[PDB]
From Swiss-Prot, chain A:
Protein name: Aerolysin
Region (Part of the transmembrane beta-barrel after proteolytic activation of the toxin and insertion into the host membrane): 233-265
Key word Signal present: yes
Origin superkingdom: Bacteria
Gene: aerA
Free-text comment on this protein's domains from its UniProt entry: The C-terminal propeptide is required for normal protein folding and secretion; it maintains the aerolysin precursor in its soluble form and prevents premature heptamerization and pore formation.
Consequence of substituting residue 367 to A: Nearly abolishes heptamerization
Marked site: Important for oligomerization: 132
Organism for this UniProt entry: Aeromonas hydrophila
């Protein structure tokens, strides 16, 4: 009937069916929809009362729901909270190059380093912080690594603790820019290392008494690559008989007769890629006149500057081992395994990388396949998790100025000349 | 009525292709040979052979095609006829040209780096031979862009070719600024030249009276 | 799939009328009662709760009702989509050109 | 046609 969020459930040991004020008993179907969550918050031989004279039982009884009565009651608020992750106002980065904007994003202590470190901590990643503090997310080193950024606790001096040297690393990469449509601008396009592919010059002659538009000159250039792989398997069988005779004239003759059979099976897989560039000129020629035309195709390196205003999204990877005491992975491993998980901070891409999808679907146990967010709510409280996730998913807006450059692209030129009277 | 629905099209295509194939095979064969006395034919030698083979082949290829098409689509007045002609030639083509342009270029430095101190980020001390190319002009890539490296010197992880902080320390900020400003000064010129190319296409499309 | 009166009951009764055996859980004797709903892959499974014990021949082989392959017949004027965003952009090809008109 |  209505979705039930396990974090809002509460047990009242006030007698058979007597909940607290602002709370009502949970019925059988609601309990069944979230059975694993409720059985997880019960004693092994505990028996609790549902509504309508039903009862749920602990892990010792396999969480059975059956008619009965008890002294403790499972209750849900009369007006529950939705628990949605709030949306915060956009953080504005001062304008610059892409790398400069990334630099300013990943060196923001209050808006980036702290919320992401706290998210890694709440999920159960061990040693999120440097050796010169005890607080989570302090004494963090930020480094530029290839095309990404790494934020890791400063592992200087010495540390006390089990495997205190295996600091959790936070990786930021795969930046994307949702542009404001009216803000994009580009500068001069410049060409270098121009190598001629092909040119054509022509005349379009109109001897009629009316303007003629029916002319076409077209130059097309195509390049393709292809590949193939073939596996063949064969079998053969052969039988030979050899005999000796005295043929009349030739004398002693050796006769061989051979019969063979063969079978073969071949399997082939291949592919190709093609790129084509076409240029056409179709002049309108005045009556009793002729027009010259020219088409040229070059290969050239192309460059131009550009700028825009954009929302900024990125991939956030968490690497480290999960704490033995408690972590939020749905299987809850206990051997301190190494773990890497990537979230997409930005528009939805898939379920495994989307915090919002998992957070919204936490009321369906069959959908809980990566992170157990109900567990984090139980450990730290709903408001704390909401605030941390709201800060982690805060939109970012920036002005970007950059340079496009590419090698061996196409450069075309199509010219319609001035008419010459006939 | 006047009619515009006519089309004559002449198209000419040329193509080249290439391919390379590598094949590897294995074979296994077992033969048995025996002697019998078959009734009528007498002494007979019988051979029985069984073979199996396996093969793997890998091919890579490519092609290039160039096509030139010319069409004529005359509008013909009512109760009339128009002759049309299309010609395609191969020809060498030439023409003079002129324009006004900004001028950019590649600047390569070749030599050995000083033992006392050099600006390469690794700071080699064995006097190695060194060639490095800068693009004086619009940006092409990080390794050839002085402006990009200069702007990014505040990020140690981006410092992968030249250590401009070292040059600033050795010579002063203003000196390096002025020298790089003079090195990257834009250049403008008027150019007059000649285009020439062999074995190009020449077309002629004619709508008559 | 959690609507008892509009989905679980009519579908359970249809299974019972066609002759499927044991349409219901172990804690009732009525058809379509004490049914568990679970999310399985991209579908849903509704099956009688097989807890405790049962009296009957093969009473543990409860009939399962599977719901999958959802489709949506859209009202034509009601579709709307938001901003299209692109990620992991890899260039394939580009061409720049000029179109010159020297005629009048 | 269907209006948008």
């Amino acid at each position: 009937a209505e979705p039930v969020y396990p974090d809002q459930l509460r047990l009242f040991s006030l007698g058979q069916g007597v909940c607290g004020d602002k709370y009502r008993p949970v019925n059988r179907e609601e309990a069944q929809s979230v059975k694993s969550n409720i059985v997880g918050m019960m004693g092994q031989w505990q028996i609790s009362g549902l509504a309508n004279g039903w009862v749920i039982m602990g892990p010792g009884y396999n969480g059975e729901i059956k008619p009965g009565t008890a002294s403790n009651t499972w209750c849900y608020p009369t007006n529950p909270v939705t628990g949605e992750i709030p949306t915060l106002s956009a953080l504005d980065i001062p304008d610059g190059d892409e790398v400069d904007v990334q630099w300013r994003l990943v060196h923001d202590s209050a808006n980036f380093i702290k919320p992401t470190s706290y998210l890694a901590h709440y999920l159960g990643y061990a040693w999120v912080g440097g050796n010169h503090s005890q607080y989570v997310g302090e004494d963090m080193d930020v480094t530029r690594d290839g095309d990404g950024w790494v934020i890791r606790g400063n592992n200087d001096g010495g540390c006390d603790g089990y495997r205190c040297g295996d600091k959790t690393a936070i990786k930021v990469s795969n930046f994307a820019y949702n542009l404001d449509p009216d803000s994009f601008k580009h500068g001069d396009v410049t060409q270098s290392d121009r190598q001629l592919v092909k040119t054509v010059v022509g005349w379009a002659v109109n001897d009629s008494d009316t303007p003629q538009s029916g002319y076409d000159v077209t130059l097309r250039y195509d390049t393709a690559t292809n590949w193939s792989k073939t596996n063949t398997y064969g079998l053969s069988e052969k039988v030979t008989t050899k005999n000796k005779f005295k043929w009349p004239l030739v004398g002693e003759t050796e006769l061989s007769i051979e019969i063979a059979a063969n079978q073969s099976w071949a399997s082939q897989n291949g592919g190709s890629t093609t790129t084509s560039l076409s240029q056409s000129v179709r002049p309108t020629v005045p009556a009793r006149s002729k027009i010259p035309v020219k088409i040229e195709l070059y290969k050239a390196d192309i460059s131009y500057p550009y700028e825009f205003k954009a929302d900024v999204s990125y991939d956030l990877t968490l690497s480290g081992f999960l704490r033995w005491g408690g972590n939020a992975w749905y299987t809850h491993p206990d051997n301190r395994p190494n773990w890497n998980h990537t979230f997409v901070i930005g528009p939805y891409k898939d379920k495994a990388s989307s915090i919002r999808y998992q957070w919204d679907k936490r009321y369906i146990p069959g959908e809980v396949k990566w992170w157990d967010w109900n567990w984090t709510i139980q450990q730290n409280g709903l408001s704390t998790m909401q605030n941390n996730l709201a800060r982690v998913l805060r939109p970012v807006r920036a002005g970007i100025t950059g340079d496009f450059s590419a090698e061996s692209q196409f450069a075309g030129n199509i010219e319609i000349g001035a008419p010459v009277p006939l």
